[PDB]
Structure formats: C-alpha cells, structure tokens
Amino acid sequence: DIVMTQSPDSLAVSLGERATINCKSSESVSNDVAWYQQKPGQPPKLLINYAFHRFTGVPDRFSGSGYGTDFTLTISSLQAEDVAVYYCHQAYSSPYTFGQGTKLEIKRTVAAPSVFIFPPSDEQLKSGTASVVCLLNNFYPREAKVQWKVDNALQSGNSQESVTEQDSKDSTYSLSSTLTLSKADYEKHKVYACEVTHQGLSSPVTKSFNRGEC
Amino acid sequence: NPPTFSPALLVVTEGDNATFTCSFSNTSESFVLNWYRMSPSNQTDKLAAFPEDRSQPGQDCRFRVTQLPNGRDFHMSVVRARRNDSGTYLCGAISLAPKAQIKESLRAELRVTE
Amino acid sequence: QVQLQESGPGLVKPSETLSLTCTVSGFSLTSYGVHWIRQPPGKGLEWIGVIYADGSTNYNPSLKSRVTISKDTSKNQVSLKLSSVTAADTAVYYCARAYGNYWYIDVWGQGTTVTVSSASTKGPSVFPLAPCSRSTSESTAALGCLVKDYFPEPVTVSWNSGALTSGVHTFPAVLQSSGLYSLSSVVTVPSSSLGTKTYTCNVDHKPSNTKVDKRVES
Ligand SMILES: *[C@@H]1O[C@H](CO)[C@@H](O)[C@H](O)[C@H]1NC(C)=O
Ligand SMILES: *[C@@H]1O[C@H](CO)[C@@H](O)[C@H](O)[C@H]1NC(C)=O
Ligand SMILES: *[C@@H]1O[C@H](CO)[C@@H](O)[C@H](O)[C@H]1NC(C)=O
C-alpha cells in the first residue's frame, strides 16, 4: 500500500514561533494530501486540502506546501489554541492511508500549581473504600512530584496520577492524584497531607486535613 | 507571474461543450496545472489536472484539460454541461521547483440556461 | 450545517458482528461519498472504507472480508458492519464526508466509541469532592466530583448542564487495579460564590444508561 510518514513524532515550540510538520509518501502522490488537526475528545478538523489550499474558514497562519512525496504543514505564528495532533492523509490510491500523527505541544513560561485536597465523600465510605484526592491546577512545565503523607507515613503505591492535555487558553497542565484506602485504614489515622514540588514554587507545598474533623 | 483564466463569464444552454482558457508563464517547463470549482461558500473542488493523475476516486470524463501546441495556454472543457455544473471556476499553476509554489489565477463565472 | 452523527453499541462481545450507523444532515448521499475511519486508543487514524456516490464500495485490505459498508438514502443513513471482531477492533469510529471530484475528507462526525470485550458492562458511581476545611482566607475554591468504577468508555461529565464551562478540568479516565475506569472532574470558582451558587455535576454513562446529577457544596 502507501505509507505516509510524519516528522517529527512530537514537537514542542514556544508561542508566536513557527512550527513545521513534514509528511512523506512511499509511492509518489500528486498533491492529493490533506492536513487535519485533532484535539483530544473532538473529531479531526480539516486544515489544508490539495497540499496547498487553506480550507475555508481556517486561520491564515496555517499553510501547506509540497507535491509528489514531500509535504509540509506550517503554522506561522503559533498560539495556544493550536496544541493538537496533526495528521496528513493521502487520497491518491486505496487504501487511503493516514500519517501516524504528530503531537504539537507548545513551550511556555514556568507556572506554579494551585493545590487543593478533598477528603472522601460521606456516601463513599459506606461502600467500604475511601479515595482522598489531591488536585494541582494550572502549572507548567509538566514535571511535578506529588507525595502523600498520612501522619507523616509516606504512601508509596496506592495512588494514581492523571494529567489533562495542555490547556488551549493558557497552555498549562493540571494533575489529579487519587489515593485509595480501605475504610478501616482511612478512619484509623487522623492527618492527611498532599505535598507537591514543582519548579514554580520556592519550596514544597503541603495541604492537609484531619480525619472526620470536616 | 501567475496564470490568467478567461473569459470572465460564458453562458451555454443545458448541454453542448463549454471551454475556458488558462494561460501561464511556462518558465521551468516542469510543472502541473489544476482546475478548480469554488462553491458559493468559498469551498474549493479540484476538477482536473494536467498532466492527468488517477481515474479511481477522481472519475469524471465530464472535465477535460488539454494542452495546446503553442504551449503557453490550456483548454479547460466541460462536456455536455448539466445545470448542476453552472458555478464559479478558477485555474491554478504549481511549479515543482524546490519552493513548489502554487501560483493562483482569478475567478471566472459559468452559466447554463435555455 | 453539514452534519454526521454515529450511533451503535458501546459494548460488543468478541466474535459478534458489530453494526454502526451514521445519520446525515445537510446533504444527500446520492451526491457525496461517505468514509468510515477508525482510531484505536492512543493510536493513529486508520481508514476503514468508503461508499461512493454511485454505490460502489472500497475497503482496506487488512479487513479482508469481515467489513461491509452499505447505505439507505431514504433514511439519509450509512451503515458499517464488521464481522468476527476481536479486541483488536475496539476503537472510536468516525463517519466522514468526501468532498468534490478528486476528493478530500472535509466534515467528520463526532465519532462513537466501541469496545470489544467478553466482560460485562458496569455503570459508575459518582461522589462529590468538596474541601474538608470550609474556605476562610482562601481566595479561590475548587470543587469536583469523582466518577469511579465503570466500564466501558466513554463517560461524559458536564457542570450545571453546560452553563459552567470556563475553568473546568475533567481529567482523562485512568484504569484501576480492578480493571475498571475512574476519572475526576474539577472546577475552580471564586470562594465568594460558594454560599450563593449551587454546583451540580452531570455525569452520564451510555453503555449502562446511567444518568446522575450530584450536588457539590460541602
Ligand atoms: C464535446 O467534447 C467531446 C470531446 O472534446 C467531443 O467528443 C464532442 O464532440 C465535443 N463537441 C461536441 C460538439 O459534442
Ligand atoms: C513548457 O515549455 C516547454 C518549452 O520550454 C514546452 O516544450 C512544453 O510544451 C511546455 N510544457 C510542458 C509539459 O513541457
Ligand atoms: C443534476 O443533478 C445531479 C447532480 O447534481 C445529476 O445526477 C443529474 O444528472 C444532473 N442533471 C440535471 C439535468 O439536473
């Protein structure tokens, strides 16, 4: 068949700069290549058609060039709402294959997280499991260390993290860490502290709450 | 140095053949032409190319593009034009030069009546 | 308003026959070809097939004979049927329109997600997330609700039926040791607005037909 190969696999460029993604075909394809952007959870949306033409209604900073086997998507002045995955697609010979996709993430200034902690809901402790959750809001870069301490007993492996994609307004991440315990283990102790270290803080941040004192 | 698409408007009557002329500064002599039809919402449809590419997904004998022996210009013809065909048409030239620009012509209108 | 909406089972057991429908608005299927495209989780887009304007079909050879694409123009509907499925077939399925002679894909449906599993469907339980210490000196307050122990994907979470969207983060679903999915959805508000406005999160889960509006105020 025909394989489209994109370059690079992922790409981090600062705001206002120019971003280029390349797509190359195994068999020559004569300009029947379209560029689509897709953000998490929504369908792909068409950016460029016929290798050069800017689709109707897509901003002026998106442009396409190339023909035969080499094609380039170029965003001129990259801004925050363009963080996405980009796919080339050939409509030349069946099967009409896609590129593997290039994730375009943007590079940003440092931003410290806003820290919150939530105790397990009262309706959840009857069911016999207690999940205490710690939330980090609007930080950058993505590397941050969240540490659970129960009466200064540091929990090692009963927590999970999950991170949003870079926000299309301010280009920050948010992270949520869920610490799961049995109900007996949860009401066996009294102090819960989420401590988070990130480059945007002068010192580690600890936020806590006492058992049942809600 | 872009190509030019003429005439600005031609009318034919629910049939026959309708042909336009697209002229270009054939510098490099190693390039491609596309012939597009732009919907009322500025959306473009690629009708043909010289040289021809593939007849699979792009199958429509209705639109021929032929090269004239003088080399400067090309005939863009719609054969037996249905009333669906009436609309705004445009020419486009692309040079395979390492920049691979797409020089782009002006709109041209086509009607079908009677 | 050129629109495509997919519908189909959120759960199919392995070796079944999987059937999806794509209802079309804003154009007629006689003049436009419709493609089916597929996206596994975290993987790329894979082209499944196409039914052209006339009616001739064309599929991806990797789907040697398990795939069948048909259409009914009277209902403005295009249907995809894929036989003898395996866990390699769980993915999001999009229908999409091909535009123009010498075509390109312009308008995509919203895609419907299909999971292939022998396992049984299970609806989520939703719990409120409010701070233990009611805010005092805290200028900004954060609320949320934890959607836990559901299968399969996907679960949608809105806040106040879509009236509150700015500053909402719903995290991607994460898989637990139980083999079940769990996510949380948080929202950031000024703490002055805690005593006046009530915040209810609206979670729903399609495969289990689960609908819940949970109060968050604590
Ligand atoms: C119209 O176009 C085709 C090909 O150029 C030709 O067969 C036909 O005779 C043409 N002219 C007329 C008058 O039909
Ligand atoms: C372009 O120019 C060359 C001479 O410069 C001419 O022979 C040719 O017919 C034109 N087009 C092509 C396809 O070469
Ligand atoms: C126009 O309608 C459709 C496509 O627009 C086509 O099937 C039909 O043959 C065309 N002819 C006329 C006379 O409308």
Residue numbers in the entry:
A (entry chain B): 1 to 214
B (entry chain C): 33 to 146
C (entry chain A): 1 to 218
Copied sentences from the primary study:
Programmed cell death protein 1 (PD‐1), an immune checkpoint receptor expressed by activated T, B, and NK cells, is a well‐known target for cancer immunotherapy. Tislelizumab (BGB‐A317) is an anti‐PD‐1 antibody that has recently been approved for treatment of Hodgkin's lymphoma and urothelial carcinoma.
Structural biology and Surface plasmon resonance (SPR) analyses revealed unique epitopes of tislelizumab, and demonstrated that the CC′ loop of PD‐1, a region considered to be essential for binding to PD‐1 ligand 1 (PD‐L1) but not reported as targeted by other therapeutic antibodies, significantly contributes to the binding of tislelizumab. The binding surface of tislelizumab on PD‐1 overlaps largely with that of the PD‐L1. SPR analysis revealed the extremely slow dissociation rate of tislelizumab from PD‐1. Both structural and functional analyses align with the observed ability of tislelizumab to completely block PD‐1/PD‐L1 interaction, broadening our understanding of the mechanism of action of anti‐PD‐1 antibodies.
